[PDB]
Amino acid sequence: APADRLKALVDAAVQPVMKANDIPGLAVAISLKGEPHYFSYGLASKEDGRRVTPETLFEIGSVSKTFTATLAGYALTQDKMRLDDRASQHWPALQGSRFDGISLLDLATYTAGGLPLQFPDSVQKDQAQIRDYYRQWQPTYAPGSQRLYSNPSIGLFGYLAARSLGQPFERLMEQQVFPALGLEQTHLDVPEAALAQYAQGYGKDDRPLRVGPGPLDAEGYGVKTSAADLLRFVDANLHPERLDRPWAQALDATHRGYYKVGDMTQGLGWEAYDWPISLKRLQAGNSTPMALQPHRIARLPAPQALEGQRLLNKTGSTNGFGAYVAFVPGRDLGLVILANRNYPNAERVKIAYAILSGLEQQGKVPL
């Protein structure tokens, strides 16, 4: 019965937004009690007229941070690191710098002291240049005091998690994490045999854009994946216990809240809200000032399990793409919305909310 009204519902949620934001192409995937439903709209590539399907690859941008967090959860589970480790414990080249005093949890949750949203332009994809950047960096704020959303920050957390496991990040992801989650259409670097599925991204004036290489790009924003595979990842998050125990615990470690900013509780990768919550409060939690400005944290006495009546989500963008994922453990409901335009987070949340709230309304006793 909830599946009955879903096409009308997703179309009403999606198409007005696609029109208002000139989105060429967009794929939705929803898990409702573990049944997958897909809805594809428009074009993966304008030039070649290729339609979006559930197998189209999209750049998911910062949604990649939840995969990064899962690898870290693995390292935690395997006793290779702890969240209270000093950063420089896992990279001797950092010993003597400010990262002697910054914890892994600080890096993971953007509280190291104001690491910038992006690396400076002058920092190339090069081990020494990244190392030298961290060695010379001086903080804006005290560690643990301010949240400033930051690629160098969770970037370093992933890179450190990988060193703790004794292997490069990309290899760990490609040979262990993606195979462990059963994801065969998920890539940090799209192989030759899959390039035909890689959507074009579209920027301002329909400039075609696909993400270029960047320092710690893999860790922060590197994943390309299909709506069907990202939904599989969401489904693993909904039911971690359906995985081989080391990976169940790894997912579980990404479902623990450390502090609040407004209505949002910060996890490793995932950000969480009480459910239900209003549309406007969820958009505020996903607002440009949330991402771009520093905020004072409300630290929780103890890590909070992000379970029950909670919604966990992550937005992610690149210059050409805009992704959003959300799941509600207490409704057994997951959702992925992938587009080849970076359109505003408030509109992504608008689509998701229409879907989530449409599905909830359906559950009432007829009176």
Which residues are tagged catalytic?
A: 62, 149
Q: Which of 233, 115, 246 is nearest to 178 (CA)?
A: 233
Other beta carbons within 10 angstroms of residue 69's beta carbon come to 25
All residues at 6 or more sequence positions from 275 whose CB lies less than 8 Å from its CB, including other chains = 309, 310, 311, 328, 330, 331
Cα separation, 6 vs 27, whole angstroms: 14
Q: Is 149 annotated as a binding residue?
A: yes
Cβ atoms of 351 and 13 within 8 Å: the answer is: yes
Q: Is 151 annotated as a binding residue?
A: yes
Q: Is 164 annotated as a binding residue?
A: no
Q: Structure tokens of 256?
A: 């623990």
Q: Is 342 annotated as a binding residue?
A: yes
Quick one: DSSP state of residue 52? P
Q: Is 118 annotated as a binding residue?
A: yes
Give φ, ψ of 142 to 5 degrees: -55, 140
Cβ atoms of 334 and 37 within 8 Å: the answer is: no
Q: Structure tokens of 175?
A: 């040979």
CA atoms within a 13 Å half-sphere pointing along the CA-CB vector of 314: 26
Radius of gyration of the chain (CA): 20
Q: How far is CA 63 from the centre of its chain?
A: 2
Known binding-site positions for a beta-lactam: 62, 118, 149, 151, 342
Known binding-site positions: 62, 118, 149, 151, 342
